[model samples]
Target: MELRHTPARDLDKFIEDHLLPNTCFRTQVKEAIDIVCRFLKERCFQGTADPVRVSKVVKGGSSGKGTTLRGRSDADLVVFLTKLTSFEDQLRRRGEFIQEIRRQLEACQREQKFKVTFEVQSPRRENPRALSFVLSSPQLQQEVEFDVLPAFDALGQWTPGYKPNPEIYVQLIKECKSRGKEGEFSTCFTELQRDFLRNRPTKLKSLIRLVKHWYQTCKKTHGNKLPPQYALELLTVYAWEQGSRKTDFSTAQGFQTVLELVLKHQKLCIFWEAYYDFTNPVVGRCMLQQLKKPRPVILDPADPTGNVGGGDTHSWQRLAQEARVWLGYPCCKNLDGSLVGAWTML
Candidate 1:
């Protein structure tokens, strides 16, 4: 038997820095967004002719940081309408807006210089508050993405109702702040997450960190192990962060739950799809199916609270479970038909 591992060298810089002066592109993106708002205002889109007033410009998709391309194929852009008139009218105007954006991209090409393409609608198929597009210029080698979104301004509060996963962003800021305060802790937490994810390890890093954090915080001391509640909290926060990025995450399994979701289904779903509303039920089923195996447990067998003493619970368990769930039932001699055993309770 042989054991394979993902070497540290293998994870070299997957993301590319295609567009230089990250700050400059941010400015130009803002400029393009301004152009869109001006066009919309001229055509009576309403609410102050200022683009900043109507929507926010976000850079994402196939470029900049955390992107795998050496150069962005196309710059992505988004136009999120904060207020809506009607789906019929919105769709009609959406095409018109795309045209107006085409002209805007054309004008910006002189300065921004990107092969720009665009679409205006609610994000993907689920989002109702955004219109996004892709911009790129392979010829000139400059590209970026813009996501213009119109969302209800919740000011700055952890109001989960009006704002979807507002706390995640807040927690991100907190996490960053903690990083700023305690460099070692933040660095370790990040490393744990990166290594675990890179090697397809369970999402125990956050939980582990949380437990360690609270234990040390209250105890005002250091030790080899951490509390379970804090560990669960960390997992929850990590999961929330991931979901916010993907806009599709679930709390049922916390952070590592998504790994199971991905592995079992061999596909990804919108965060909301996995989390709630069952908007994409098929994808959801696939995602949930990822949790069927030995399961990513924090504790060893016979131990309800797996605090430090649990034996190694690794990905092999996850792999075995996935195999069982995916393969279905066994072939029987006496039985006429095949039996599918998805889950067996111990």
Candidate 2:
């Protein structure tokens, strides 16, 4: 994984120089994605002999979330199967459906219809839910990696904002309880996660890019031992909301605050009422249980089942050390030779 490392002080310049992917590349990727979607729609949804059909194919991950990087672009395709309406149905059946998708892709490749390398997943799980592959285009001069996931069509009932019908979450709580597998069915809520960050202010999204870039650099050293990238994304949003909610603020300061949060991660307990609130007793009690879980409890704004922060603490510790090292650079000091003080975390 070759990552372009930019100086911490030059983050704003880095944003313009390297963070943003070129327009031509994006257009090509979009075209390829359209072809993929069309293939899925016709073969997987319409022409399939099975009674269950794909209801929707959602764009997700960095591309869908609008935080795509230059060299490494990841697109998450959540294929919502019409038959898997409930979260429970998604959990029990998504793996087989994903296998069918893989089989179809392989057939397409065998027929020379699709040009891409489908990475063979080391089948460690009895039932896997996602099929990841990389697509390359000579015209675009780039490769786009995709994780095709099978999910229940939960977004069909969703609308913008925190005030989704309380019954939705009530049902989610029931599902989580009965299944005893919280965060297992998060792919079902892909739309909500994408929407939460997509509509954010431009500056905030820029901050997110900066953080993601930093995470990529760290990933080079840590590999799969690192914490979940989505957790850090949520942490960035949390830092921005707590440090600078205005449209305009110092990017350096915002970046610095996130690093500080990384250093003090044990005290982090964050959530948002942007999609689902605690007004409903069922939801409230469930939230209270989640909040009481452990340190660094950053709940997913969309899916109550997901606790994004619940990963290896050692990963956060490694990142905190890296943050400290970056702060020692001139980037973390004011012109007058004063060390930059971190924002007061609420």
TM-scores for every candidate against the unseen true structure: 0.31, 0.83
lDDT of 2 by residue, 54-165 (tens): 6666778763222344545677778877755578886677677777777655554554344433343443355433467666666545666777778777656556754567
TM-score: model 2 vs. ground truth:
0.83
How well is each residue in 20-105 modelled by candidate 1, as lDDT tens digits? 22445446545655665555434433454534222433332222232332233333333434444322233445555555544444
The lDDT for every candidate, in the order shown, is 0.32, 0.71
User: Model 1, residue 283: displacement in angstroms?
Assistant: 20
The ten-residue window of minimal lDDT in model 2 covers 1-10
**Clashing pairs counted in every model:** 35, 1
What root-mean-square deviation over C-alphas does model 2 reach?
Answer: 4.3
- Residue-level error in angstroms, candidate 1, position 130: 16
